[PDB]
């Protein structure tokens, strides 16, 4: 309930909401992280915006969703502390970087686990169980996808260039569930090719490439089937993209893909 109940270990990275640090829970020694939100400049109706969102996401529970643990207010530091599961295996962006450095494509099996488990995660957001929510992730990219010790997927974190900008957002249309699917298509594509499906140096020529909807096949190392389903998420028409259910129906997706390395 208070900062005193936790001991900061060190500081990881600083993302959107603010700083993110690894921590030990005083009472039993569990390693975790939390995320700072300085609320010190917010109003009392800018705040009301945050608190409903924070509660919505707090109810989200899934083995491939980063687990919520605690919230903490600190008037002194005017900071809101959201405490969450620590993800030992880092993020997929590092995995992609590593593939690039080593010049080694990832196994189709590893891509199939990631696709399967992010799809289960998004399904719990989009549908799910019972349940009220309907949540869209709205920021699906490798830096927001973490791995545990057995490299299982944890979906987290609900001037640069927006490679994964969907065709809806780019044509003034509201972000919908199929926009999550486009983002997943970009991520899986980049996971295979070790580069995103549309590259460019200016945003206006990236927008142009995205509008035409054309890109390289993922490497030949990968099956026609995997290329097909990823390509399907990159349909320009959102109603031509698979839903999370259609994805999971794919013959490629098997039981062993749902858990551990
Ligand atoms: N770079 S790295 O490869 O060395 C490595 C990376 C991340 C982690 N672990 C980890 N990180 C998080 O966010 C850190 C990250 C989140 C997005 C914004 C910037 C900061 C988490 N949020 C919940 N659980 C989290 N777990 C371990 C090693």
Author numbering: 3 to 160, 177 to 279
Sentences from the paper on this structure:
Preliminary data attained following a medium-throughput screening campaign, identified purines bearing 6-alkoxy substituents (e.g. 6; CDK2 IC50 = 0.005 μM; Nek2 IC50 = 12 μM) as dual inhibitors of Nek2 and CDK2.
Nek2 (NIMA-related kinase 2) is a human cell cycle-dependent serine/threonine protein kinase that localizes to the centrosome. However, Nek2 does play a key role in ensuring timely assembly of the mitotic spindle, a scaffold that is vital for accurate segregation of sister chromatids during mitosis. Phosphorylation of these proteins by Nek2 in late G2 promotes linker disassembly and loss of centrosome cohesion; this in turn allows the timely separation of centrosomes in prophase.
